[PDB]
Structure 1
Amino acid sequence: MATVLTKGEIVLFALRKFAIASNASLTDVEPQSIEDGVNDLEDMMSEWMINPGDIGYAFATGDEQPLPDDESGLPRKYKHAVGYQLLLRMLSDYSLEPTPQVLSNAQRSYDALMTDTLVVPSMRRRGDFPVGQGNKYDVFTSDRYYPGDL
């Protein structure tokens, strides 16, 4: 994609959005808070394979370790949602509580992500339900009664 999201960029976004490590609040950044953040992101993405479903995350192949310089594989349309969810999960490390505006932003981004993965399964006919004489089950098609399976 456009510039390719790395796993370190997402955790830096989350750290910046609450004024923990950025150049436009005071100063500073730590190296352990990065490994902790990246591991938290990996575990979150593992969990998301259940409720929100797969979104294309690129996991580490074999054991090794994630490393912040690895390519995430996510489209750029998801970074705000992922970053806000990660910030919500990792706020309590520093003993902080989110403000209402942060919660509102997180909910809006999550809703945008949810809208892009809908299915609406569209239930089918049963299998003992007849198909009428009107569509000529003898000659044109075969098998009067719907299959309703496959």
Structure 2
Amino acid sequence: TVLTKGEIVLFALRKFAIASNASLTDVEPQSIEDGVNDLEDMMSEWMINPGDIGYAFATGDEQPLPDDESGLPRKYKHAVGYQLLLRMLSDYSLEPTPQVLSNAQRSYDALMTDTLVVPSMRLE
């Protein structure tokens, strides 16, 4: 295994459960199987914007499963997992901790952009 859909989902579900418990709302997190549908849907939305990161979608009649490879390298786990977490928190009006918000924004920025160091146009 490299990085399964289930592992990404569990990363988010674990953190959701912590937030949910803290808020006393005591919302039960969805199953890993249903969280995979949530991830699949988020990835589908991203295809529209900001674009394709190479996720391996279930096609045709296939149902995505926790043990399916995500198509992503392990280094993407936090970036995608934190976005899935923000999605889940938002569903139950739970505000993310400042740490979660920061981790999500920094990992997302790192996933979607790069900063290149080049000789200046004047020098080139």
Q: TM-score, normalised by structure 1?
A: 0.63
Paired position in structure 1 for 2:115: 117
Question: Hey, what's the Cα distance between the residues in 2 that align with 1:36 and 1:22?
Answer: 17
Higher relative CO (CA 8 A, sep ≥ 6), structure 1 or 2? 2
Q: Does the aligned pair in 2 maintain the 1:21–1:28 contact within 8 Å?
A: no
More displaced stretch, 30-39 vs 7-16: 30-39
Note closer, same or farther for the CA distance 1:117–1:21 as it changes in structure 2 (3 Å cut): same
Paired position in structure 1 for 2:69: 71
Q: Does the aligned pair in 2 maintain the 1:16–1:22 contact within 8 Å?
A: no
Note closer, same or farther for the CA distance 1:22–1:95 as it changes in structure 2 (3 Å cut): closer
Deviations 1:42-100 (A, max 9, x none): 01111111222111111112123111111111012211110000000012445522111
**Number of corresponding residues:** 122
Question: Hey, what's the Cα distance between the residues in 1 that align with 2:13 and 2:104?
Answer: 15
Q: CA deviation at 1:122?
A: 15
Q: TM-score, normalised by structure 2?
A: 0.75
Q: Does the aligned pair in 1 maintain the 2:17–2:29 contact within 8 Å?
A: no
Q: Does the aligned pair in 2 maintain the 1:15–1:87 contact within 8 Å?
A: yes
Question: Hey, what's the Cα distance between the residues in 2 that align with 1:47 and 1:81?
Answer: 16
Provide structure 1 residue ranges, at least 5 long, that are not aligned to the other structure.
124-149
Note closer, same or farther for the CA distance 1:37–1:22 as it changes in structure 2 (3 Å cut): same
Note closer, same or farther for the CA distance 1:57–1:108 as it changes in structure 2 (3 Å cut): same
Paired position in structure 2 for 1:146: none
- Give the structure with the higher percent helix: 2
Question: Hey, what's the Cα distance between the residues in 2 that align with 1:120 and 1:91?
Answer: 40
Q: Does the aligned pair in 1 maintain the 2:17–2:28 contact within 8 Å?
A: no
Paired position in structure 1 for 2:89: 91
Q: Does the aligned pair in 2 maintain the 1:15–1:21 contact within 8 Å?
A: no
Percent of residue pairs identical: 99
Q: Does the aligned pair in 2 maintain the 1:37–1:90 contact within 8 Å?
A: no
Paired position in structure 2 for 1:4: 2
Note closer, same or farther for the CA distance 1:111–1:21 as it changes in structure 2 (3 Å cut): closer
